[PDB]
Design a protein around this ligand. Structure first.
Ligand SMILES: *[C@@H]1O[C@H](CO)[C@@H](O[C@@H]2O[C@H](CO)[C@@H](O)[C@H](O)[C@@H]2O)[C@H](O)[C@H]1NC(C)=O
Ligand SMILES: *[C@@H]1O[C@H](CO)[C@@H](O)[C@H](O)[C@H]1NC(C)=O
Lengths: 49, 48
């Protein structure tokens, strides 16, 4: 749901969200992403699951 | 003691970052722990 919202808010009012009580599978993130920038700092993007 | 790194737990830093980026963190941990061990050994030698 977070990825195919049709009205991503502008930067000046950066809309927040909360992700809790769920199983984070980032394969869906990979699927819904012609990735251009996936620079991960505090964690390795390969090892997320 | 984190010793100037992200985490103070070897198991979790290993399980969080990939080798070619976590090598810096583990090297920092190694330096700190080796320095502490050297201090301990020197103090033990003096007391002995
Ligand atoms: C930021 O983006 C969120 C993700 O879409 C919005 O949450 C949704 O809000 C709608 C309407 O309230 C709910 O029906 C839906 O279940 C989801 O919670 C959120 O509203 C949005 N922020 C603002 C201020 O609108
Ligand atoms: C949103 O959901 C539709 C449903 O099929 C999907 O085709 C689309 O790729 C999704 N978009 C994103 C950005 O996840």
């Amino acid at each position: 749901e977070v990825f195919n919202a049709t009205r991503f808010a502008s930067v000046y009012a950066w809309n927040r969200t909360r992700i809790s009580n769920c199983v984070a599978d980032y394969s869906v993130l990979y699927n819904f992403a012609p990735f251009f920038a996936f620079k991960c700092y505090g964690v390795s993007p390969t090892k997320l699951n | 003691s984190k010793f100037g790194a992200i985490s103070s737990v070897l198991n979790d830093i290993l399980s969080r970052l990939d080798p070619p980026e976590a090598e810096v963190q583990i090297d920092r941990l190694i330096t700190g722990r080796l320095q502490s061990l050297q201090t301990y050994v020197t103090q033990q030698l003096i007391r002995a």
